[PDB]
Design an enzyme around this catalytic site. Structure first.
Site, PDB file in Angstrom:
ATOM      1  N   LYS A   8      10.162  21.395  10.353  1.00 53.51           N
ATOM      2  CA  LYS A   8      10.838  20.219   9.635  1.00 53.51           C
ATOM      3  C   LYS A   8      10.613  18.846  10.484  1.00 53.51           C
ATOM      4  O   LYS A   8      11.049  17.841   9.922  1.00 53.51           O
ATOM      5  CB  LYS A   8      12.316  20.557   9.267  1.00 53.51           C
ATOM      6  N   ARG A  39       6.484  26.883  28.879  1.00 52.11           N
ATOM      7  CA  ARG A  39       5.034  26.756  28.847  1.00 52.11           C
ATOM      8  C   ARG A  39       4.591  26.127  27.644  1.00 52.11           C
ATOM      9  O   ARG A  39       5.023  26.395  26.433  1.00 52.11           O
ATOM     10  CB  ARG A  39       4.815  28.368  28.626  1.00 52.11           C
ATOM     11  CG  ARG A  39       3.063  28.522  28.524  1.00 52.11           C
ATOM     12  CD  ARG A  39       2.648  30.014  28.683  1.00 52.11           C
ATOM     13  NE  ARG A  39       2.816  30.421  29.884  1.00 52.11           N
ATOM     14  CZ  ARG A  39       2.148  31.629  30.672  1.00 52.11           C
ATOM     15  NH1 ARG A  39       1.753  32.401  29.706  1.00 52.11           N
ATOM     16  NH2 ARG A  39       2.085  31.827  31.807  1.00 52.11           N
ATOM     17  N   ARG A  78       3.877  38.762  30.957  1.00 57.32           N
ATOM     18  CA  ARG A  78       4.637  38.691  32.062  1.00 57.32           C
ATOM     19  C   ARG A  78       5.479  37.649  32.515  1.00 57.32           C
ATOM     20  O   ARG A  78       6.524  37.691  32.743  1.00 57.32           O
ATOM     21  CB  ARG A  78       3.630  38.445  33.293  1.00 57.32           C
ATOM     22  CG  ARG A  78       2.965  39.682  34.067  1.00 57.32           C
ATOM     23  CD  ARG A  78       1.571  39.402  34.590  1.00 57.32           C
ATOM     24  NE  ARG A  78       0.763  39.287  33.248  1.00 57.32           N
ATOM     25  CZ  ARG A  78       0.354  39.913  32.417  1.00 57.32           C
ATOM     26  NH1 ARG A  78       0.429  41.337  32.734  1.00 57.32           N
ATOM     27  NH2 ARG A  78      -0.311  39.655  31.180  1.00 57.32           N
ATOM     28  N   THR A  79       5.289  36.267  32.110  1.00 55.63           N
ATOM     29  CA  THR A  79       5.715  35.242  32.533  1.00 55.63           C
ATOM     30  C   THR A  79       7.156  35.120  31.934  1.00 55.63           C
ATOM     31  O   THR A  79       8.256  34.802  32.453  1.00 55.63           O
ATOM     32  CB  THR A  79       5.053  33.867  32.503  1.00 55.63           C
ATOM     33  OG1 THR A  79       3.849  34.182  33.324  1.00 55.63           O
ATOM     34  CG2 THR A  79       5.856  32.841  33.021  1.00 55.63           C
ATOM     35  N   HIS A  94       1.031  26.529  37.728  1.00 57.05           N
ATOM     36  CA  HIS A  94       1.767  27.412  37.365  1.00 57.05           C
ATOM     37  C   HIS A  94       2.646  27.876  38.779  1.00 57.05           C
ATOM     38  O   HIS A  94       2.244  28.892  39.382  1.00 57.05           O
ATOM     39  CB  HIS A  94       1.102  28.893  36.981  1.00 57.05           C
ATOM     40  CG  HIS A  94       1.580  29.982  36.261  1.00 57.05           C
ATOM     41  ND1 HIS A  94       2.824  30.077  36.436  1.00 57.05           N
ATOM     42  CD2 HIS A  94       1.246  31.066  35.563  1.00 57.05           C
ATOM     43  CE1 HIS A  94       3.380  31.181  35.683  1.00 57.05           C
ATOM     44  NE2 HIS A  94       2.405  31.628  35.318  1.00 57.05           N
TER      45      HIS A  94
END
Lengths: 287, 290, 303
Positions: free
Chosen positions: C90, C111, C62-63, C139
């Protein structure tokens, strides 16, 4: 100029059997109208503000990229949803995944190995779904681009002699191509270079007088269609003047790189016809 | 105005650019910056497609190329990396207007060129070059310092495998009158001969001074208009030796060799360097696809 | 039309705590106006030439997707940075990564499974960062779109009875939602439905204590979905384990006529597919509201 094919408006596309001859011809001419405009260097804004989302549960080089470029060249956008980086890893069901992408998108392009998966998706999605290939041999936009390729390169599909070559036992995707060709066009002759497939066609095979011969091919064929009995420069010495070699791709050794320079080698151009046919399809579904 | 000399060309090496080409690119980058920062939209490449073909990882190069295409009104088809490189190139070529390729093998850019119908921009070919990195570096010097001729530059780090320094040295020696070049590296990681030898004549003719050192001496700190370090130490303590009018550059990514203690120094240009990179690539992409 | 919510101009979004009730209603109303325009078929160009870069170090459906779709439908663009294919392999630090995407982007959507990674990011980013989930912390944009869902479905947020159900301990969405509702609205009753092991943490409940007292909000812990919870709640907001707390058709016989079932999603067995044809089942519609709330937000941040 770029008239959408009316019969496809709002339709999910999961099988080549969903198209009449008349749809097939209309899509061919629409794709040609798309090529003209794009190669003129002109922009299309036909699908501005519309979203495709791909749901690929299997890998694809061609088909995924082709679908994305088509949408973009219609003026639309693409949400880069990736199955492997999704909430499916937290137990989300396939049905819930569809409803999720359906809350944001105008069209979904689904590639999943199982036919009943696309079917479950169709039963919950409010927006159209286009099938980008499954293990049952349903690859409708491949069947259509192949047919566009023959029509554009040779001038016509009616009247042709075609060899199908490779894994024609388990190659379910070419069984579909044969069915579309046989049901909609007047094929002169098929070669199958190598029961349940040819039987449903026996009627139209007889009615239309299509000569069949399992296996001479090199001399008579207008189209040598091969899948992953090797085609190379030596074998091409025996081919006719106006003919093509096609391959959905990817290839292994069945199609030598020694063919690639031959102007009759049509399997790279085939991919670009694919972009235009997919433009024709997306516009027609979403107009 | 797009730089005419680049029209429909692929970009494989620093060696393909004239001094006039570079300044044209630079002046074009700087105009693009000013319009972007004033919130102006540029719809120059609407309906053109770039495909990034990255066989090695990247944060900057990948993202700046995508960002630059987008800021020109262009679009990007992402492509995740059994089939041959040539067959892959033809596939991407069938729908794209331009390819951006980074590949660990040095000669793969050349093989792709041999089957690609559309322009390919070399975004790193093994130990060879990084052409667009040198263009954006030179844009950084021009913008931050006000001139490029007459500078004293230190190239620090792994000069052996650093594609960026290969391209950057090539670009400055051929097309500018740099005053001095420190090559700061341990013997086994020094700038190879296959880079230095072909430039000999130009070095001689323009009187460029070349000094090799195994460590970052105080002289180096005290005389350089530009410190350009690379990855495999400059810190705030060592920055106390730097002149007032100068910059520290690094193509990135960094590990220990460039400390976070430098980051707040006005002379730390290596972050702004990424943004100059975006504007340079806009200039490049526009020029190629005009 | 669609004037932006001025107070969000140039602002990072880290916490449900950063908003006022005025900001909340303005965003809710802007999202509704975005919905009308998109559903009328208008093609927006409000953010033509602007870039969002998603930076996801955890999985998302969803997000990620709603944020990309929101940016697109505003006429903006997305650079598809992949963490797995990046120069983090790296040796590159989070901070340098942020500075890298920040050099090209107008807005970052982040996120990350570490709760304080968002603070590190904000410390170096010149451009706005939107918190799409920071560990089991918050959230915030979920809480905004949840509240738009409630407002649009029920017509009011003040005076409701809401059950927050499931894993409240680790559920970052219920953390944000409880803070957002308590601080800015006159909630009548919150049921906190969870076994003791998974109850709402004190680091959430304790800061709200004054407000709950001054507004007379009733807070009641239960272990299961009791008849009381089912009969009184205007919203049932359920979550996935990150107890007999399962909502199914038979349990829904106790629900009131005017109410909604919500889930931020993804769901497992705690929310049965037998509920999905019920008109009170709002958890799909909730996703689409989410796209429109993220459009309101992205526009307000970037105008």
């Amino acid at each position: 100029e770029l008239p959408p094919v009316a019969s496809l408006k709002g339709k999910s596309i999961t099988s080549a059997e969903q198209f009449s001859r008349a749809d097939i011809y209309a899509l061919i001419h629409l794709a040609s109208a798309m090529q003209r405009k794009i190669d003129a260097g002109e922009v299309l804004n036909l699908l501005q503000g519309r979203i495709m989302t791909p749901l690929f549960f299997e890998d694809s080089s061609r088909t995924f990229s082709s679908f994305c470029a088509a949408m973009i060249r219609l003026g639309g956008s693409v949400v880069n949803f990736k199955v492997e980086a999704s909430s499916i890893n937290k137990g989300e069901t396939l049905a819930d995944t569809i409803r999720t992408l359906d809350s944001y998108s105008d069209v979904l392009v689904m590639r999943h190995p199982r036919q009943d998966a696309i079917e479950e998706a169709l039963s919950v999605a409010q927006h159209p779904i286009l099938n980008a290939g499954n293990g049952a041999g349903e690859h409708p936009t491949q069947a259509l681009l192949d047919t566009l390729t023959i029509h554009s390169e040779l001038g016509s599909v009616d009247g042709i002699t075609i060899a199908l070559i490779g894994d024609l036992k388990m190659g379910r995707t070419v069984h579909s191509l044969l069915k579309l060709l046989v049901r909609n066009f007047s094929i002169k002759c098929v070669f199958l270079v190598a029961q349940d497939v040819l039987e449903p066609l026996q009627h139209e095979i007889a009615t239309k007088g299509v000569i069949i011969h399992r296996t001479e091919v090199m001399q008579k064929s207008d189209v040598l269609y091969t899948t992953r009995i090797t085609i190379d420069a030596a074998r091409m010495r025996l081919a006719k003047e106006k003919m093509i070699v096609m391959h959905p791709l990817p290839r292994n050794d069945e199609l030598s790189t020694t063919v690639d320079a031959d102007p009759r080698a049509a399997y790279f151009r085939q991919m670009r016809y694919g972009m235009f046919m997919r433009m024709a399809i997306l516009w027609s579904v979403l107009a």
